[PDB]
Structures are given as structure tokens and as C-alpha cells.
Amino acid sequence: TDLAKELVSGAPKELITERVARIYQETETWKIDWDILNKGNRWENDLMGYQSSSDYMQGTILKFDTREGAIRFAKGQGWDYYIQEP
């Protein structure tokens, strides 16, 4: 429960120290996504107009079957999170 599983996960420290996650029920499952970077979320590629990014969590969306599972998992990874109340 209180184990610092982030110590043996292998993920970088910024998920714990800098990035903030959101727990929300969008309409039957609970999801976890990450708030965008203030800078570096997107920037237009000068060559072909592609959308560049340095956010490696931009496409990651965890799914959970209960509200309890989403909160328990986020705590187990030491994530900074806020719950978006439905």
C-alpha cells in the first residue's frame, strides 16, 4: 500500500517531481492522463508542418474499472494527481 514502487519501476523522476496526473470519469471507466507541458507540448515542424513534441506521456491513457483502482494505483507510483469530480 505505502510501498514506494516508483523506486523499482524504472520510470524517470519527473513523473513524481514535475508532471501532474488527472483522474477522471469521462462515461463508465476511470482514466488517468497527464496535464500538458506549459512549453514543449507541441510546436510546428518548420520542414513539413508536423506537430513535434517532447512530452513522452502525451499519448498515454490508463484505464480503470473503479475509482478506487485509479487512486490506489496513482498513490502506489508516487504520482502527483488530482481527481476531476464527475
Binding site: 512549453k39 514543449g40 510546436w43 510546428e44 515542424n45 518548420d46 513535434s52 517532447s54
Partner: peptide
């Protein structure tokens, strides 16, 4: 300038 300074930045 765009990006954080990697290869893809300008």
C-alpha cells in the same frame, strides 16, 4: 525558438 532543445527543436 520552438522545442526544448533536442534534435527536433529549432
Amino acid at each position: 525558438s520552438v522545442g526544448q532543445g533536442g534534435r527536433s527543436s529549432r
